[PDB]
């Protein structure tokens, strides 16, 4: 062996931290191959490999490695390690759609954190439980009681998280709680409360110079103001989102903000502006081969052109809408 288990694992850690989980996995898998009798080290390798696979969207392997970690953490009596493995299992189960199992795992992380008087772990588990319940609520077709109950549970967990990270003075974590809390209120139809939460999210984003969080807050504020009937205000927030979005490598962000602006201007009965924004979304949806998006663009454009009496363009987009609609039949 030219490198030891520990040496290989350390390189994997660094590669993953650097954003190259693919390369990191190779080093962790090399480390597991070499092996070690140090069970704490082995559990750390499994945990890191589980997270790397999670980030590479191999959720089955993520689950396998987080389970291997859980097994070892229990056998050596590493309570913190068991809590972490359980939280990781929960978050993996969440993405797989196994929400009720995710709840148990994430609650286990919470329970052990409390047993250990680990408030940082406790807070993180509360955030995770809010996230599981939020996604659970959406899985039931977001007004059905199963949706309302899960989303309300999400509010409760996010509020408990926010209290604890306020006690811990973790301002960036407060910002994250506010964002997810706001979007949960939004789904529940509590639009004023969504505005209150996203306003805090935005203030916190600005305190940190966090341009991504700022952009998210603008987008979510726009969304909430649409449902409050405040279309002009929504347009102002969506324009602020778009100013940032148009600079991003991920073109979907600009596309969505343009679609939203298109709809806002339709609601304001400014059909010329609506068309401008909808044409931008159409171009990007085509670039990204998003046929559902392209179809929705053609519908929105046809509606707007019709309102202006531009039947030549409206009918161009009717044809394309019909074509795409059959394709996505």
């Amino acid at each position: 062996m030219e490198a030891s288990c520990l040496e290989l694992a350390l390189e994997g850690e660094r590669l993953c931290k650097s954003g190259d989980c693919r390369a990191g996995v190779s080093f962790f898998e090399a480390a597991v191959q070499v092996g070690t009798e140090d069970l704490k080290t082995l559990s750390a390798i499994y945990s890191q490999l589980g997270n790397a696979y999670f980030y590479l969207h191999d959720y089955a392997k993520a689950l396998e490695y987080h389970h291997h970690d859980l097994t070892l953490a229990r056998t050596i009596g590493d309570q913190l390690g068991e809590a972490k493995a359980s939280g990781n299992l929960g978050n993996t189960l969440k993405v797989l759609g196994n929400f009720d199992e995710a709840i148990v795992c994430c609650q286990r992380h919470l329970d052990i954190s409390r047993e250990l008087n680990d408030k940082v772990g406790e807070a993180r588990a509360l955030y995770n439980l809010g996230n599981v319940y939020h996604a659970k609520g959406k899985s039931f077709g977001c007004f059905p009681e199963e949706v309302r109950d899960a989303l309300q549970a999400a509010v409760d967990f996010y509020e408990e998280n926010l209290s604890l990270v306020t006690a811990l003075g973790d301002r960036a974590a407060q910002g994250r709680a506010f964002g997810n809390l706001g979007n949960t209120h939004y789904l529940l139809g509590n639009f004023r409360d969504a505005v209150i939460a996203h306003e805090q999210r935005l203030l916190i984003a600005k305190e940190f110079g966090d341009k991504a969080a700022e952009r998210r807050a603008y987008s979510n504020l726009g969304n909430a103001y649409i449902f409050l009937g405040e279309f002009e205000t929504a347009s102002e927030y969506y324009k602020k989102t778009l100013l940032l979005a148009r600079q991003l490598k991920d073109r979907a962000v600009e596309a969505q903000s343009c679609y939203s602006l298109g709809n806002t201007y339709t609601l304001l009965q400014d059909y010329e502006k609506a068309i401008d924004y909808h044409l931008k979304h159409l171009a990007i949806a085509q670039e990204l081969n998003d046929r559902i998006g392209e179809g929705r663009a053609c519908w929105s454009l046809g509606n707007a052109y019709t309102a202006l009496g531009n039947h030549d363009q409206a009918m161009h987009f009717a044809e394309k809408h019909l074509e795409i609609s059959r394709e996505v039949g």
Partner: peptide
Amino acid sequence: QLLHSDHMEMEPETMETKSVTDYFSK
């Protein structure tokens, strides 16, 4: 008249992390 999109911007998610650099922990 309108087809509203289902997009909203959720916050970053976490995982719990371990490191072999915790070798000397009790």
